[PDB]
Design an enzyme around this catalytic site. Structure first.
Site, PDB file in Angstrom:
ATOM      1  N   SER A   1     -11.651  11.358  -3.627  1.00 37.70           N
ATOM      2  CA  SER A   1     -11.153  11.033  -2.305  1.00 37.70           C
ATOM      3  C   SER A   1      -9.644  10.783  -2.366  1.00 37.70           C
ATOM      4  O   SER A   1      -9.047  10.668  -3.439  1.00 37.70           O
ATOM      5  CB  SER A   1     -11.892   9.820  -1.748  1.00 37.70           C
TER       6      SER A   1
ATOM      7  N   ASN B   1      -7.769   9.309  -5.474  1.00 33.87           N
ATOM      8  CA  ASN B   1      -8.655   8.403  -6.195  1.00 33.87           C
ATOM      9  C   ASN B   1      -9.459   9.164  -7.248  1.00 33.87           C
ATOM     10  O   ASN B   1      -9.618  10.382  -7.182  1.00 33.87           O
ATOM     11  CB  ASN B   1      -9.611   7.697  -5.233  1.00 33.87           C
TER      12      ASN B   1
ATOM     13  N   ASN C   1      -8.921   5.508   3.281  1.00 32.12           N
ATOM     14  CA  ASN C   1      -9.606   6.344   2.299  1.00 32.12           C
ATOM     15  C   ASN C   1     -10.488   7.387   2.978  1.00 32.12           C
ATOM     16  O   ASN C   1     -11.220   7.086   3.925  1.00 32.12           O
ATOM     17  CB  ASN C   1     -10.452   5.469   1.367  1.00 32.12           C
TER      18      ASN C   1
ATOM     19  N   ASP D   1     -15.526  -4.379   9.787  1.00 31.90           N
ATOM     20  CA  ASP D   1     -16.723  -3.798   9.196  1.00 31.90           C
ATOM     21  C   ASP D   1     -17.465  -4.753   8.270  1.00 31.90           C
ATOM     22  O   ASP D   1     -18.477  -4.355   7.682  1.00 31.90           O
ATOM     23  CB  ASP D   1     -16.358  -2.525   8.424  1.00 31.90           C
TER      24      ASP D   1
ATOM     25  N   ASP E   1     -12.599   9.304  -7.719  1.00 31.58           N
ATOM     26  CA  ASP E   1     -13.811   9.934  -7.203  1.00 31.58           C
ATOM     27  C   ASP E   1     -13.540  11.197  -6.389  1.00 31.58           C
ATOM     28  O   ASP E   1     -14.486  11.766  -5.834  1.00 31.58           O
ATOM     29  CB  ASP E   1     -14.608   8.933  -6.357  1.00 31.58           C
TER      30      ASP E   1
ATOM     31  N   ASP F   1      -6.305   8.584  -0.269  1.00 30.03           N
ATOM     32  CA  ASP F   1      -5.844   7.558   0.668  1.00 30.03           C
ATOM     33  C   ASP F   1      -4.602   8.044   1.417  1.00 30.03           C
ATOM     34  O   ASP F   1      -3.695   8.615   0.808  1.00 30.03           O
ATOM     35  CB  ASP F   1      -5.505   6.257  -0.072  1.00 30.03           C
TER      36      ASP F   1
ATOM     37  N   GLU G   1       0.820  -1.209   0.000  1.00 27.03           N
ATOM     38  CA  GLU G   1       0.000   0.000   0.000  1.00 27.03           C
ATOM     39  C   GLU G   1       0.858   1.265   0.000  1.00 27.03           C
ATOM     40  O   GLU G   1       0.538   2.233  -0.698  1.00 27.03           O
ATOM     41  CB  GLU G   1      -0.931   0.002   1.211  1.00 27.03           C
TER      42      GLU G   1
HETATM   43  C1  LIG Z   1      -8.485   0.882   3.576  1.00 19.34           C
HETATM   44  C2  LIG Z   1      -9.642   1.582   2.945  1.00 19.34           C
HETATM   45  O1  LIG Z   1      -9.931   2.744   3.228  1.00 19.34           O
HETATM   46  N1  LIG Z   1     -10.340   0.867   2.056  1.00 19.34           N
HETATM   47  C3  LIG Z   1     -11.489   1.380   1.325  1.00 19.34           C
HETATM   48  C4  LIG Z   1     -12.708   0.476   1.542  1.00 19.34           C
HETATM   49  O2  LIG Z   1     -13.124   0.576   2.899  1.00 19.34           O
HETATM   50  C5  LIG Z   1     -13.863   0.853   0.618  1.00 19.34           C
HETATM   51  O3  LIG Z   1     -14.801  -0.217   0.588  1.00 19.34           O
HETATM   52  C6  LIG Z   1     -16.091   0.097   1.138  1.00 19.34           C
HETATM   53  O4  LIG Z   1     -16.064   0.156   2.561  1.00 19.34           O
HETATM   54  C7  LIG Z   1     -17.339   0.405   3.168  1.00 19.34           C
HETATM   55  C8  LIG Z   1     -17.098   0.574   4.648  1.00 19.34           C
HETATM   56  O5  LIG Z   1     -16.445  -0.562   5.198  1.00 19.34           O
HETATM   57  C9  LIG Z   1     -18.275  -0.751   2.845  1.00 19.34           C
HETATM   58  O6  LIG Z   1     -19.544  -0.546   3.458  1.00 19.34           O
HETATM   59  C10 LIG Z   1     -19.859  -1.634   4.360  1.00 19.34           C
HETATM   60  O7  LIG Z   1     -20.208  -2.849   3.656  1.00 19.34           O
HETATM   61  C11 LIG Z   1     -20.506  -3.958   4.521  1.00 19.34           C
HETATM   62  C12 LIG Z   1     -20.787  -5.149   3.633  1.00 19.34           C
HETATM   63  O8  LIG Z   1     -20.253  -4.974   2.328  1.00 19.34           O
HETATM   64  C13 LIG Z   1     -21.679  -3.614   5.435  1.00 19.34           C
HETATM   65  O9  LIG Z   1     -21.888  -4.690   6.342  1.00 19.34           O
HETATM   66  C14 LIG Z   1     -21.395  -2.336   6.211  1.00 19.34           C
HETATM   67  O10 LIG Z   1     -22.541  -1.962   6.967  1.00 19.34           O
HETATM   68  C15 LIG Z   1     -21.023  -1.206   5.256  1.00 19.34           C
HETATM   69  N2  LIG Z   1     -20.698   0.002   5.997  1.00 19.34           N
HETATM   70  C16 LIG Z   1     -21.194   1.206   5.691  1.00 19.34           C
HETATM   71  C17 LIG Z   1     -20.748   2.341   6.562  1.00 19.34           C
HETATM   72  O11 LIG Z   1     -21.965   1.371   4.751  1.00 19.34           O
HETATM   73  C18 LIG Z   1     -18.420  -0.858   1.335  1.00 19.34           C
HETATM   74  O12 LIG Z   1     -19.224  -1.986   1.005  1.00 19.34           O
HETATM   75  C19 LIG Z   1     -17.049  -1.015   0.680  1.00 19.34           C
HETATM   76  N3  LIG Z   1     -17.179  -1.018  -0.767  1.00 19.34           N
HETATM   77  C20 LIG Z   1     -16.558  -1.899  -1.559  1.00 19.34           C
HETATM   78  C21 LIG Z   1     -16.810  -1.751  -3.028  1.00 19.34           C
HETATM   79  O13 LIG Z   1     -15.825  -2.775  -1.109  1.00 19.34           O
HETATM   80  C22 LIG Z   1     -13.387   1.063  -0.818  1.00 19.34           C
HETATM   81  C23 LIG Z   1     -14.458   1.631  -1.718  1.00 19.34           C
HETATM   82  O14 LIG Z   1     -14.793   2.961  -1.347  1.00 19.34           O
HETATM   83  O15 LIG Z   1     -12.286   1.980  -0.850  1.00 19.34           O
HETATM   84  C24 LIG Z   1     -11.166   1.487  -0.162  1.00 19.34           C
HETATM   85  O16 LIG Z   1     -10.068   2.320  -0.349  1.00 19.34           O
END
Ligand SMILES: CC(=O)N[C@@H]1[C@@H](O)[C@H](O[C@@H]2O[C@H](CO)[C@@H](O[C@@H]3O[C@H](CO)[C@@H](O)[C@H](O)[C@H]3NC(C)=O)[C@H](O)[C@H]2NC(C)=O)[C@@H](CO)O[C@H]1O
Ligand SMILES: [Cl-]
Ligand SMILES: [Cl-]
Ligand code: NA
Length: 129
Positions: free
Chosen positions: A50, A46, A59, A101, A48, A52, A35
């Site tokens: 945002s 990124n 992120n 999460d 969008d 990292d 990373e």
């Molecule tokens: C290290 C880092 O920052 N990584 C980023 C990822 O965190 C991010 O993925 C998205 O993260 C969110 C929050 O964890 C995910 O939402 C969660 O999804 C689970 C099930 O999928 C659900 O149980 C949770 O309630 C829900 N939380 C919220 C607050 O909604 C989301 O699904 C992830 N999306 C994907 C496509 O994996 C990604 C994408 O923004 O970016 C990374 O950099």
């Protein structure tokens, strides 16, 4: 700060990451290498809008506030700049929330593509832990 491999392993272990949610220490060291190349000051933008931040490239769309990611969440309740410190406490504490999460370490794209399914124990070989 740019950490050494074993220096980082020892710091992460002291902060409770070894086997946190079932992920052995080698997983966390491997993720950090790919990373950020072990550099606490790493940033990347990124598509969008945002950004990292830090050794684990957390992120700003979800986890920290940088004042320039409109309509984003701050789920670790910290300024993103705190994640760039030579002290990894803030990055570690936020990472614990991320990996809990739902998606485990798949939240880190480089872990999924370059560490998952490999012999991650080799990343802590030779270290005094
Ligand atoms: C290290 C880092 O920052 N990584 C980023 C990822 O965190 C991010 O993925 C998205 O993260 C969110 C929050 O964890 C995910 O939402 C969660 O999804 C689970 C099930 O999928 C659900 O149980 C949770 O309630 C829900 N939380 C919220 C607050 O909604 C989301 O699904 C992830 N999306 C994907 C496509 O994996 C990604 C994408 O923004 O970016 C990374 O950099
Ligand atoms: Cl390991
Ligand atoms: Cl898991
Ligand atoms: Na944010």
């Amino acid at each position: 700060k740019v950490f050494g491999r074993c220096e980082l392993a020892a710091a992460m272990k002291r902060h409770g990451l070894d086997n946190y949610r079932g992920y052995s220490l080698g997983n966390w060291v491997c993720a950090a290498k790919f990373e950020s190349n072990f550099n606490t000051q790493a940033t990347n933008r990124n598509t969008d809008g945002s950004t990292d931040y830090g050794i684990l490239q957390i992120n700003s769309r979800w986890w920290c506030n940088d004042g320039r990611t409109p309509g984003s969440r701050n789920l670790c309740n910290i300024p993103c700049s705190a994640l760039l410190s030579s002290d990894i406490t803030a990055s570690v504490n936020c990472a614990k929330k991320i990996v809990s999460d739902g998606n485990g370490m798949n939240a880190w794209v480089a872990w999924r593509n370059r560490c998952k399914g490999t012999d991650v124990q080799a990343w802590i070989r030779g270290c005094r832990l």
